[PDB]
Amino acid sequence: HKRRLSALGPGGLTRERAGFEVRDVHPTHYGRICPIETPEGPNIGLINS
DNA sequence: AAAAAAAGAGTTGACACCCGGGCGAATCCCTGCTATAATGGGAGCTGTCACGGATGC
Structure with missing residues (x-):
């Protein structure tokens, strides 16, 4: 919970107002943002760690 | 075979009292008056579209 990177606030x-591009995963996240830990609720792709 | 009274009613004075209405007293709300010089204002988006409509020359 301390290594979390939120996008709201x-x-x-x-x-x-998120859309579809913000929730999508970018190929630069290799080794900087794990694209496997994300809530499967409405705010998907915005609470990555 | 007869014949009157503890209750049951009915009151009659005798307190005990319990909020109500005044008499106070103690204390709240309003309003105005202060005299050196005061002289234009701080957030807020801005990382969704798309439609469906309202103004203009």
């Missing part, structure tokens, strides 16, 4: 894209 005061200055972040709202869940309704």
Whole structure:
């Protein structure tokens, strides 16, 4: 829970304003952001660690 | 074979009292008055579309 990287808050894209590109995984996350730990709820692809 | 009374009613004075209405007293709310010089304002998006409609020359 301490190694979490959220994308919301005061200055972040709202869940309704996320879209499809923000939730998608980018090929630069190799070794910097694990694309396997993410909540399977509505805010998918925004709480990656 | 007869014939009157503890209850059952019915009151009659005799307190005990319990909020109500005043008499106070103690204390709240309003309103105005202060005299050196005061002179234009701080967030907020901005990382969804798409449609469906309202103004303009």
